[PDB]
CSV table of C-alpha atoms in Angstrom, one decimal:
chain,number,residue,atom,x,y,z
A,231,UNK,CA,50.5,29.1,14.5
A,232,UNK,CA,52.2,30.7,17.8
A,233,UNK,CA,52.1,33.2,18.7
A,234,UNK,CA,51.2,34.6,15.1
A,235,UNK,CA,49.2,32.2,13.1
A,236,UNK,CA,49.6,31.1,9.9
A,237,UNK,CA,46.7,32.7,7.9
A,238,UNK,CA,47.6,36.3,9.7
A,239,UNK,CA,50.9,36.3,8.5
A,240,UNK,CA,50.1,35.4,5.1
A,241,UNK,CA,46.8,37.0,4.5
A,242,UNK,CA,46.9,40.2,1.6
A,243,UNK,CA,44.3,42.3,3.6
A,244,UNK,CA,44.1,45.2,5.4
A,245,UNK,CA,43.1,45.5,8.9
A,246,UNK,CA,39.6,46.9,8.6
A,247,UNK,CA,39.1,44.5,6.3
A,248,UNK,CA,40.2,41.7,8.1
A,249,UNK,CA,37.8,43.3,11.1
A,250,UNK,CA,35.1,43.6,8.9
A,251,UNK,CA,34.9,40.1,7.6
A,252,UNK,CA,35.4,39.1,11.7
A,253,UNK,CA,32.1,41.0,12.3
A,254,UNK,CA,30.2,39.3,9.6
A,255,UNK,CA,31.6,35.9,10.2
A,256,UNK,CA,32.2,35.6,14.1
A,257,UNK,CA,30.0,38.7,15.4
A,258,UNK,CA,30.4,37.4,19.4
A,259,UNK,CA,34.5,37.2,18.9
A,260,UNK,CA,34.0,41.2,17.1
A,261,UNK,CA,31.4,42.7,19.5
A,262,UNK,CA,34.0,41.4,22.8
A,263,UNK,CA,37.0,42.9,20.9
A,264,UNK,CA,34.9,45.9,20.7
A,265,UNK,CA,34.2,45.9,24.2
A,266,UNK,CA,37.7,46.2,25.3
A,267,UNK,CA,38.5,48.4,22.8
A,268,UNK,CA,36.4,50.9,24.3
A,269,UNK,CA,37.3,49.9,27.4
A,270,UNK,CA,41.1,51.0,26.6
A,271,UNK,CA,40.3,54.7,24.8
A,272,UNK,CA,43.5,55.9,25.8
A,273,UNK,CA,45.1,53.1,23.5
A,274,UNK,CA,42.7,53.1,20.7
A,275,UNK,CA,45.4,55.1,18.2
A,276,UNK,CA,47.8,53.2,19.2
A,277,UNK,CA,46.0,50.2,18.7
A,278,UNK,CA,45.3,51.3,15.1
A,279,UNK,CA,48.9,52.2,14.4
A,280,UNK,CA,50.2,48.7,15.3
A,281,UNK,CA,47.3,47.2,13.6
A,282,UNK,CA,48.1,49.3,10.2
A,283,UNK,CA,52.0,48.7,10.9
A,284,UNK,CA,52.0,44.7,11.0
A,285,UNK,CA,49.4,44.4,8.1
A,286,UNK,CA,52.1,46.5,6.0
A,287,UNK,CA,54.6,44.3,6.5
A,288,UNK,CA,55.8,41.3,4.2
A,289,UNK,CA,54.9,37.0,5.5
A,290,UNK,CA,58.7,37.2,6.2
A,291,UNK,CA,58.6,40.3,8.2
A,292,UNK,CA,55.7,39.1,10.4
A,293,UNK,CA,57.1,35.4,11.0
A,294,UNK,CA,59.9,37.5,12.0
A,295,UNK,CA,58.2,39.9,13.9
A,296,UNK,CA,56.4,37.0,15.6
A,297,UNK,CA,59.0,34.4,16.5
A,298,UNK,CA,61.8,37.3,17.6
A,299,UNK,CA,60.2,40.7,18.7
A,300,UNK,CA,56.2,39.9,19.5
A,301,UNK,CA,55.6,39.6,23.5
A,302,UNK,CA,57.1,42.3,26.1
A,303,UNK,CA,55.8,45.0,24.0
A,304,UNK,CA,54.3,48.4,25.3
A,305,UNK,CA,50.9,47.7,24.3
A,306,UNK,CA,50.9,44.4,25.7
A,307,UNK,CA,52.4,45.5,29.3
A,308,UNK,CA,49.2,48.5,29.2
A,309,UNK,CA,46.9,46.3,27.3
A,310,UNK,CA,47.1,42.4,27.0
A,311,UNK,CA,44.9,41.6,24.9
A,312,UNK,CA,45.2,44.9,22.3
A,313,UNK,CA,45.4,42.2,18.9
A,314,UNK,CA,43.7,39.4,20.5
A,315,UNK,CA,41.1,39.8,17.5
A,316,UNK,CA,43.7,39.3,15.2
A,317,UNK,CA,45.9,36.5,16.8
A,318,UNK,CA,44.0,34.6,19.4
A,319,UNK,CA,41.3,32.6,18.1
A,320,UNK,CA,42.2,30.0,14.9
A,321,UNK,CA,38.7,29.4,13.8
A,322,UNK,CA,38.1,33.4,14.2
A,323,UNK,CA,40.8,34.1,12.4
A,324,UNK,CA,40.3,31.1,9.6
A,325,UNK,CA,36.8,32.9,8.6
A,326,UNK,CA,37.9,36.3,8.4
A,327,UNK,CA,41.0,35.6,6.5
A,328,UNK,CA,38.5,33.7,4.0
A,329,UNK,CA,36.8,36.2,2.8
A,330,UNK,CA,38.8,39.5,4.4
A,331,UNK,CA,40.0,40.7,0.4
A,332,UNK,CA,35.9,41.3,-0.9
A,333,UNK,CA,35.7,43.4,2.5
A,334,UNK,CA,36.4,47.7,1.5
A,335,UNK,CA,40.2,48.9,2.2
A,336,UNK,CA,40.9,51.2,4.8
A,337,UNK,CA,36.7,51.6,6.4
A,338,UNK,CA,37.5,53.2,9.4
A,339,UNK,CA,33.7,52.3,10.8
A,340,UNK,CA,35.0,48.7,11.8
A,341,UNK,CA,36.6,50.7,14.8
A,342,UNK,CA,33.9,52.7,15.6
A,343,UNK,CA,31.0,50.1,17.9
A,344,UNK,CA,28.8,50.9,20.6
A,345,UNK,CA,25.9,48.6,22.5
């Protein structure tokens, strides 16, 4: 379950639909990701690519990715927390992962938030 946990790397969805189901399910955890989200516009695309890459890859390829290459990365080093959504909270992530495959693929609104 570190760094990656173990839903994330098996889990079918895509990212907006793993974000979606995170808004429904734990709202507070969403709305904060949001916040710094749009507190880091110059990394928003980037953001999105890395989001998009890792959720195309395999369970093998991510347990890879996250016990030999995740940590030291550029988006980390400009951005710490840039996939905390996705990899920091167990509970946040056991919800979303739930129900994440009902949620519509690719709806780019999950990335779009304001107050």
């Amino acid at each position: 379950d570190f760094p990656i946990p173990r839903r994330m790397i098996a889990t079918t969805c895509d990212a907006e639909q793993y974000l979606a189901a995170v808004r429904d399910t734990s709202p507070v955890y969403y709305q904060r990701y949001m916040i710094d989200f749009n507190n880091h516009a110059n990394l928003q695309q980037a953001t999105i690519n890395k989001a998009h890459w890792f959720f195309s890859l395999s369970p093998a390829e991510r347990r890879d990715y996250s016990e030999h290459f995740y940590n030291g990365d550029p988006l980390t080093f400009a951005w710490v927390n840039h996939m905390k959504i996705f990899f920091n909270n167990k509970g946040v992530v056991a919800k979303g992962t739930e129900v994440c495959n009902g949620y519509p693929a690719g709806d780019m609104s999950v990335w779009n938030w304001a107050h």
